[PDB]
Amino acid sequence: FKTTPVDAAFVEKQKKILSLFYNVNEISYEAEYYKVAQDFNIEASKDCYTNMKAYENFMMMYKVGFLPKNLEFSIFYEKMREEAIALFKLFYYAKDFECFYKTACYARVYMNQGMFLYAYYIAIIQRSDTASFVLPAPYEAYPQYFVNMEVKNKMDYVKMMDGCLDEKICYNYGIIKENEQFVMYANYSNSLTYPNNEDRIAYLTEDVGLNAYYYYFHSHLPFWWNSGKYGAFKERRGEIYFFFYQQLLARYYMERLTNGLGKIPEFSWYSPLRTGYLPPFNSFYYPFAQRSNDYELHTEKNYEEIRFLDIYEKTFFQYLQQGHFKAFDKKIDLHSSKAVNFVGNYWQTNADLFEEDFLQFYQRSYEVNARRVLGAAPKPFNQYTFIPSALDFYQTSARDPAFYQLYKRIVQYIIEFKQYQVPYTQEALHFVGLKISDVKVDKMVTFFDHFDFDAFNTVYFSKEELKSSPHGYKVRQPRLNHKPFTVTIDIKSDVATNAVVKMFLGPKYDENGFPFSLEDNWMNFYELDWFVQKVNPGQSQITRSSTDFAFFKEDSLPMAEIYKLLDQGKIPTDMFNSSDTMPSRLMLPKGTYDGFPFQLFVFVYPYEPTPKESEPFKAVVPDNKPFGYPFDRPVLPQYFKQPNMFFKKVLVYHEGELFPYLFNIPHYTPDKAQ
């Protein structure tokens, strides 16, 4: 519930930014943004931009025309990408906030909804003056991607009937009036959307924050954008790539573990993919593409793409087999520091992997092609109209099990390369004159909580209604969550030093009930937190609350609540400092009444600062150390018995109901955690 103060100039500018997220699916002919848009003469505005070549480029594509309103926009299709990147460059190179805003009002009014939102979200995140301003949560901007079609439909019907037929009847269908607004209860999906064991974890993969999280990841550093803005970070880009996915997959594999699901399965482009998924969405023209269980990847429609994909991976194998090779106009050694970066950019086909300021249409991307084949859609009708899968959007990608299958496949390939890195030696890890004597944690408890957000942006309003910037329509759904807990660390030091304290969470046992060995477990640990303590000689005890963990955040406030906070000169400080991290809700994987066993790994090493990175991301240790150190590479497990290391077995309990559905039953009062 934490805030940050803000003056009137901010408030007024902020409000201007947010005003464009109102009733995104329509136009209020009475809005201020509409007057600005009408007043804006795009052909006479060359002087609004600091880059005339970008403006000229836009005006050219614009003279021929863009993606029409009402078609689905996706970053994964070439022409739409060029157009969206072009729009973004105008947003970005606008000289001023006033020029930025006029341009944004223009695009808001005259361009495809999805395109505009896409570029506007990114621009705000990216523009120097505009960063430090808050954005509505991805699910409040794009409800259509965060709301399964049962509810979305009920919403259509409720709006068409301007309320309920008879209030008791739609109490039974989970629809409520609460404070002049509607609330629809929403369950997670059937086996008619997840038609296999994967359904056990719908509550994770359909989770709105998880999905938001991935969308924020993309938006902070789009594959198509070079690193110029982040200077010295350019060097660490590929390294992020690995860390982001490795880390995400670890979090995901933990959920599997507590639902008895075991290892994410391998697959092949020459065989059928066992595990299907039926996205519960529809676009303007099309229901989303369904991928049934045992879907044949290898058919006529996909042959040429499979040829592409196969060689793409096999050339990585050739790079591993040589060790030094000239590739992409560089001479690159895989014992080199620069290697980690290369690898990452190679798999993502970055703008950085090439010359490029902005990615050339013609540089074929393994991720792009992978998502087309796994999405299982029919081939696009023309280049403005394609049949959407979940893999077509960062908002929806984490929903399809095939997503984790793809990125696990990538991560394994990079781990294959990671054999070329030099495993940390003993004195390397050994912190001289520093020992952790004990670690102690509070009770770790997961549980479920209803959570609300306003889905009004996917609901339609009348000419009259739009004047009021109407937003009646809320989705209440049980989401994972845990109680706050503290870790206390007992330390003995010879000397006063400065130390970094990192603590990770990972698995304890196989699916066979065997202890994981570190040589096989290191990729399965995810970072919870890091910080810097001045450490005194003698015995000390460091306490750390789950509330202060570096890698997690509070939920976003609805746009309504943001405005209510501006009215009293404030902003939600997590939405401010760190919108791009995992929600704290999802910090722990769902536990059991037993207590599910995991290891908390605590690690203390010497703090040796470097000049602050200017960061596209999660502020990471002001260190020359890698991301996710010391788990950034294969280990020699002997070297992990150091006195400044501590593995502590920890059990995650659960409380109240065991399944989200038990919360959305009309007339049943659930067991709520206390």
Partner 1 sequence: IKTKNVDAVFVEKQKKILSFFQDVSQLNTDDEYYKIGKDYDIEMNMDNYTNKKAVEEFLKMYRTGFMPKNLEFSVFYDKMRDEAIALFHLFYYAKDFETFYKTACFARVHLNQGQFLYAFYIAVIQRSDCHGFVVPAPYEVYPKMFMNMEVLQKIYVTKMQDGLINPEAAAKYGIHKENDYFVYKANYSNAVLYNNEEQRLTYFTEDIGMNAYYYYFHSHLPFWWTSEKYGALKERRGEVYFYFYQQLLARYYFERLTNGLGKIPEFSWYSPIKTGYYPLMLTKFTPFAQRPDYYNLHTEENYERVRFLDTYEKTFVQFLQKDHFEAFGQKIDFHDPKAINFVGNYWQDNADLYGEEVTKDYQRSYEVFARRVLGAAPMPFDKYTFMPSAMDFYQTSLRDPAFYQLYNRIVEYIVEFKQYLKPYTQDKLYFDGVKITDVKVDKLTTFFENFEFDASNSVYFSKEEIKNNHVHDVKVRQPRLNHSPFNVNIEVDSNVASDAVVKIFLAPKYDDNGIPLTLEDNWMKFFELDWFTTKLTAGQNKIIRNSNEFVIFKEDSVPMTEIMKMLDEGKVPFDMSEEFCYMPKRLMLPRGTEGGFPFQLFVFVYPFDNKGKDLAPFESFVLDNKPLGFPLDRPVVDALFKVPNMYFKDIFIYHEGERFPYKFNIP
Ligand X SMILES: *[C@@H]1O[C@H](CO)[C@@H](O[C@@H]2O[C@H](CO)[C@@H](O[C@@H]3O[C@H](CO[C@H]4O[C@H](CO)[C@@H](O)[C@H](O)[C@@H]4O)[C@@H](O)[C@H](O[C@H]4O[C@H](CO)[C@@H](O)[C@H](O)[C@@H]4O)[C@@H]3O)[C@H](O)[C@H]2NC(C)=O)[C@H](O)[C@H]1NC(C)=O
Q: Could you say whether residue 377 binds Na ion (CB under 5 A)?
A: yes
Of residues 296 and 442, the one with the C-beta less far from Na ion: 296
Window 634-673: contact mask with ligand X (x via CB under 6 A): ---------------------------x--xxx-------
Q: Nearest-CA neighbor of 450 among 669, 192, 171? A: 669
Look at the block and give the residue holding tokens 């004195």.
427
Work out the number of other CB atoms within 10 angstroms of the CB of residue 511: 12
Q: Could you say whether residue 592 binds partner 1 (CB under 8 A)?
A: yes
Q: Could you say whether residue 174 binds ligand X (CB under 6 A)?
A: yes
666: partner contacted, choices partner 1, ligand X, Na ion, none (Cβ within 5-8 A by kind): ligand X
Stretch of 220-228, 280-288, 397-405, 523-531 lying at the interface with Na ion (CB under 5 A): 397-405
CB of 447 to ligand X, least distance (A): 18
Q: Residue 547 corresponds to which amino acid?
A: T
Of residues 71 and 414, the one with the C-beta less far from Na ion: 71
Show the tokens assigned to 362.
Answer: 């013609």
DSSP-derived pairing of the beta strands 582-583 and 552-553? parallel
CB of 670 to ligand X, least distance (A): 11
Q: Give yes or no for a contact between 75 and 114, defined as CB atoms under 8 angstroms apart.
A: no
Work out the number of other CB atoms within 10 angstroms of the CB of residue 363: 14
259: partner contacted, choices partner 1, Na ion, ligand X, none (Cβ within 5-8 A by kind): partner 1
CB of 42 to ligand X, least distance (A): 13
DSSP 8-state class, residue 128: T
Q: Give yes or no for a contact between 457 and 143, defined as CB atoms under 8 angstroms apart.
A: yes
- To which H or E segment does residue 220 belong? helix 208-220
- Candidates 30, 52, 68, 440; binder of ligand X (CB under 6 A) is 68
Return the SS3 of 521. helix
Q: Could you say whether residue 187 binds ligand X (CB under 6 A)?
A: yes
Window 182-221: contact mask with partner 1 (x via CB under 8 A): ---------x-----x-xx---------------------
- Candidates 65, 260, 513, 611; binder of ligand X (CB under 6 A) is 65
CB of 208 to ligand X, least distance (A): 16
List, in sequence order, every residue forming a beta bridge with 451; answer none if it has no partner.
477
Number of residues that bind partner 1 (CB under 8 A): 19
Q: Could you say whether residue 511 binds partner 1 (CB under 8 A)?
A: yes
Return the SS3 of 347. helix
Q: Using CA atoms, how far apart are residues 626 and 418, in angstroms rounded to an integer?
A: 13
Q: Using CA atoms, how far apart are residues 312 and 327, in angstroms rounded to an integer?
A: 13
* Contacts (Cβ under 8 Å, ≥6 apart) of 134: 14, 17, 18, 562, 571, 572, 575, 576, 579
- Candidates 18, 415, 658, 673; binder of partner 1 (CB under 8 A) is 658
Of residues 201 and 353, the one with the C-beta less far from partner 1: 201
CB of 383 to ligand X, least distance (A): 12
513: partner contacted, choices partner 1, ligand X, Na ion, none (Cβ within 5-8 A by kind): partner 1
Window 20-59: contact mask with partner 1 (x via CB under 8 A): ----------------------------------------
659: partner contacted, choices ligand X, Na ion, partner 1, none (Cβ within 5-8 A by kind): partner 1
Q: Could you say whether residue 149 binds partner 1 (CB under 8 A)?
A: no
Q: Could you say whether residue 538 binds partner 1 (CB under 8 A)?
A: no
Q: Could you say whether residue 262 binds partner 1 (CB under 8 A)?
A: yes
Buried b (16+ CB within 10 A) or exposed e, 526-551: bbbbbbebebeeeeeebebebeebbb
Q: Could you say whether residue 673 binds partner 1 (CB under 8 A)?
A: no
* Range list of H helices, 349-447: 366-375, 401-417, 426-429
CA 43 → CA 47, 56, 103, 305, 362, distances in Å? Answer: 10, 10, 12, 41, 29
Terminal CA-CA length for the chain: 19
Q: Give yes or no for a contact between 151 and 186, defined as CB atoms under 8 angstroms apart.
A: yes
Q: Could you say whether residue 259 binds partner 1 (CB under 8 A)?
A: yes
619: partner contacted, choices Na ion, partner 1, ligand X, none (Cβ within 5-8 A by kind): none
CB of 237 to ligand X, least distance (A): 36
List, in sequence order, every residue forming a beta bridge with 49; answer none if it has no partner.
94
CB of 174 to ligand X, least distance (A): 3
Strands (DSSP E) found in 464-584: 473-482, 486-493, 497-507, 526-535, 538-545, 552-553, 570-572, 582-583
- Candidates 423, 595, 606, 670; binder of partner 1 (CB under 8 A) is 595
Stretch of 61-69, 391-399, 571-579, 637-645 lying at the interface with ligand X (CB under 6 A): 61-69
Whether residue 572 is preceded by a cis peptide bond, meaning omega within 30 degrees of 0, is: no
Q: Could you say whether residue 594 binds partner 1 (CB under 8 A)?
A: yes
Q: How many CA atoms lie within 13 A of 76 on its CB side?
A: 23
Stretch of 47-55, 65-73, 137-145, 356-364 lying at the interface with ligand X (CB under 6 A): 65-73
Look at the block and give the residue holding tokens 């895989």.
334
CB of 186 to partner 1, least distance (A): 17
CB of 659 to partner 1, least distance (A): 4
Of residues 260 and 611, the one with the C-beta less far from partner 1: 260
List, in sequence order, every residue forming a beta bridge with 184; answer none if it has no partner.
175, 475
Look at the block and give the residue holding tokens 């960061």.
615
Can you give 574-603 as a three-state secondary structure string?
A: HHHHCCCCEEHHHCCCCCECCCEEEEEEEE
Q: Give yes or no for a contact between 323 and 335, defined as CB atoms under 8 angstroms apart.
A: yes
Binding site for partner 1 (CB under 8 A): 191, 197, 199-200, 259-262, 510-513, 592-595, 658-659, 661
Binding site for ligand X (CB under 6 A): 65-66, 68, 172, 174, 185, 187, 661, 664-666
Binding site for Na ion (CB under 5 A): 377, 380, 386-387, 401, 404
